[PDB]
Write a protein that binds this ligand. Structure first.
Ligand SMILES: *[C@@H]1O[C@H](CO)[C@@H](O)[C@H](O)[C@H]1NC(C)=O
Ligand SMILES: [Ca+2]
Length: 476
């Protein structure tokens, strides 16, 4: 599927090892500190697609599918998929080639997309760099395919970042020489044939900044589908230029201020408001970035605060921001694990309740986005407009004039006081009825064109014209 096809999608990101077992158990042990395979599979995902689709997601992002190092290392198993050795075999822990094809077709039968995580930068090996037997890597079965052994020490030296190895003396990540034509041609043939064999709709590419830029346009072209890169830098001047070589990047620039804004009642709405406007003007296309606050590489949002109103607000933001919403399996059940491995909790241990507070919030937010998009082909290309901020508030507008979603978010938290925020700049006309589609209340635009927004319980407010909700299942 093209970058234009992907603009309207909403992604549920999951760890294949941690989301669903074939036996559908909600009680099988998964102690994250063990760092071992807990038994999740492609078949388990198929069996829980109703759970995912019930929150209004249109797509899933699964962890890499290639065969891994076999060892249980001092850091555990390759349960995460980022330690590949044989790219022409699948990780049999998750199932067979027929199971991955059955997952692609099950998503396609529901009108959903499959996005698959891939690594081009490195292989994985149990042991120090000097111990590596290059013959285990398929097809890169020789030292000749790899950069000379060194670790990245100076992350300010882009040459060392690209040419030296990640990992450490316990688990080595042998760094492919991605400047060699033979490595380019191998990766390019592989990625086109992966997408083609499994009917994959898009790729998330791990570890983009560690591969030199001239590798990426050939890779994105070979895949023949939307590619969203992991470029791990909060500076849009470093990260946004990668959109010149790849369709999308994960919105790490928005991540840091978005987390800060909602993780405490002290959070800076200024830093978030300012970064939205920097990304909107200085990134090649803000509408092809991936918005998130939670993944398997950072502490979960609930690890910073268990305030459910703050979690509702940050989820509403992720879904209503420019670009593609990405929610990480467990976020919807308020999971609170810290850094790796604590943030790889098994989704099944929740029991997959469809009545949890954040399952319901995400369902409501995805419902108005999915609905608004079905009635407004301009929603996804209208750049999100922050129209208001104060110490505890940010409001933003997105969508074609007369159909705009107007979102008011708060970091007051669940103890927040009850008041009326007189909001200017929403662009609706006096007497217009709006539905607040999270709480299903109506608000009427005033004589002066200001919206009297009811604030209470630190709750997020999402406004849309009541007349435009004709015939939708929202707030029935
Ligand atoms: C796709 O299938 C063909 C077998 O026809 C094979 O030549 C190729 O290696 C496969 N690609 C992947 C990535 O499995
Ligand atoms: Ca590299």
């Amino acid at each position: 599927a093209t970058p234009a096809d992907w603009r309207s999608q909403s992604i549920y990101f999951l760890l294949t090892d941690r989301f669903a077992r074939t036996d559908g158990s909600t009680t099988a042990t998964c102690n994250t500190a063990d760092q071992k395979y807990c038994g999740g599979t492609w078949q388990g995902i198929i069996d829980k697609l109703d759970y995912i689709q019930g929150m209004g997601f249109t797509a899933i992002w699964i962890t890499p599918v290639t065969a891994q190092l076999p060892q249980t290392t001092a850091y555990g198993d390759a349960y995460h998929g980022y330690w590949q050795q044989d790219i022409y075999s699948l990780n049999e822990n998750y199932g067979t080639a027929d199971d991955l094809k059955a997952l692609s077709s099950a998503l396609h039968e529901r009108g959903m997309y499959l996005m698959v995580d891939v690594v081009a930068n490195h292989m994985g090996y149990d042991g120090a760099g000097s111990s590596v037997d290059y013959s285990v890597f398929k097809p890169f079965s020789s030292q000749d395919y790899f950069h000379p052994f060194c670790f990245i020490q100076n992350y300010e030296d882009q040459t060392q970042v690209e040419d030296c190895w990640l990992g450490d003396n316990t688990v080595s990540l042998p760094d492919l020489d991605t400047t060699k034509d033979v490595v380019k041609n191998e990766w390019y043939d592989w990625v086109g044939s992966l997408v083609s064999n499994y009917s994959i709709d898009g790729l998330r590419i791990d570890t983009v900044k560690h591969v030199q830029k001239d590798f990426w346009p050939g890779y994105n072209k070979a895949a023949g589908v939307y590619c969203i890169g992991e470029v791990l830098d909060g500076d849009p001047a470093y990260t946004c230029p990668y959109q010149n070589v790849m369709d999308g990047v994960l919105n790490y620039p928005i991540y840091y201020p978005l987390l800060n804004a909602f993780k405490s009642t002290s959070g800076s709405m200024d830093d978030l408001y300012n970064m939205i406007n920097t990304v909107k003007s200085d990134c090649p296309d803000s509408t092809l970035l991936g918005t998130f606050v939670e993944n398997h590489d950072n502490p979960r949002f609930a690890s910073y605060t268990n305030d459910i109103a703050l979690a509702k607000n940050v989820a509403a933001f992720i879904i209503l921001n420019d670009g593609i919403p990405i929610i990480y399996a467990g976020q919807e059940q308020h999971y609170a694990g810290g850094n790796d491995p604590a943030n790889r909790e098994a989704t099944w241990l929740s029991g997959y309740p469809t009545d949890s507070e954040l399952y319901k919030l995400i369902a409501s937010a995805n419902a108005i986005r999915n609905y608004a998009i079905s009635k407004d082909t301009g929603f996804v290309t209208y750049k999100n407009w922050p129209i208001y901020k104060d110490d505890t508030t940010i409001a933003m507008r997105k969508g074609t004039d007369g159909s705009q979603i107007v979102t008011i978010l708060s970091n007051k938290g669940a103890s927040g006081d009850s008041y009326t925020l007189s909001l200017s700049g929403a662009g609706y006309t006096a007497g217009q009825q709006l539905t607040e589609v999270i709480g299903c209340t109506t608000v009427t635009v005033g004589s002066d064109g200001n919206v009297p927004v009811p604030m209470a319980g630190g709750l997020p407010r999402v406004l849309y014209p009541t007349e435009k909700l004709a015939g939708s299942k929202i707030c029935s």
